[PDB]
């Protein structure tokens, strides 16, 4: 019989064996290209400052002012979501997630079927 430490180790290797995949490898590659992109870096800092300005407009109870900045932030995020480099990232992330899900499922399903002799 095995303890939870044996099983957590066995899993930590499979996790590396999962980092050793096309999918994960693609992910890091799209991850590289988005902060390298100085249109993305522009918005993530434009909004970063706009977010900090909203903290002040919270203290300074100003309905119209805080929502002017709020409407400008939310729209700038949606506009940032239309950049193809982040569009690639969002997909690769999902593809990685699916493999992790599939792996996790194949495991629980073997266990849940085989458990009762």
């Amino acid at each position: 019989l095995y303890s939870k430490k044996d099983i957590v180790q066995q899993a930590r290797n499979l996790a590396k064996m999962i980092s050793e995949t096309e999918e994960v490898d693609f992910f890091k590659r799209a991850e590289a290209q988005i902060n390298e992109n100085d249109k993305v870096s522009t918005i993530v800092n434009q909004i970063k400052a706009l977010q900090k300005q909203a903290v002040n407009l919270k203290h300074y109870e100003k309905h119209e002012a805080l929502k002017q900045v709020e409407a400008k932030i939310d729209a700038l995020q949606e506009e940032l979501e239309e950049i193809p480099v982040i569009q690639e990232f969002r997909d690769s992330q999902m593809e990685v997630n699916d493999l992790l899900q599939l792996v996790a499922h194949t495991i629980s399903n073997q266990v849940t079927n085989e458990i009762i002799t």
Binding site: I7, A104, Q110
Partner: protein, 115 residues
């Protein structure tokens, strides 16, 4: 390149399967299946559940809406306090945890494996 993943996920699962948590889950289920009054309560719960759901979709105008709802609550409370049921439901979760700690572990050394 492909099998290398299945084979290791199968090892990990066969490990969980011959783990202390599994051998327990097994024996608790056997204890429950062999138990007869837990069976009496379970068969009943099965009947009341169906009745409850039927009345529930019929709406609050139903004659036994209040009654069947109590009957439902009460039979649950019989399972809740049945030792053999309770014992198994705990054993079920211990295993479910083993499964999730594993799921988390797979996810951790992928998030950190980027750096």
């Amino acid at each position: 390149e492909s099998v290398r993943l299945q084979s290791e996920a199968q090892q990990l699962a066969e490990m969980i399967l011959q783990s202390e948590t599994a051998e327990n889950y097994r024996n608790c289920y056997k204890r429950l299946q062999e138990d007869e009054e837990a069976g009496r309560i379970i068969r009943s719960f099965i009947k009341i559940k169906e009745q409850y759901e039927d009345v529930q979709r019929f709406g609050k105008y139903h004659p036994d809406y209040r009654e069947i709802s109590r009957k439902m609550r009460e039979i649950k409370r019989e399972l809740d306090l049945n030792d053999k049921v309770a014992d198994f439901k705990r054993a079920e979760n211990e295993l479910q945890s083993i499964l999730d700690e594993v799921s988390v572990e797979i996810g951790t050394a992928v998030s950190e494996h980027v750096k």
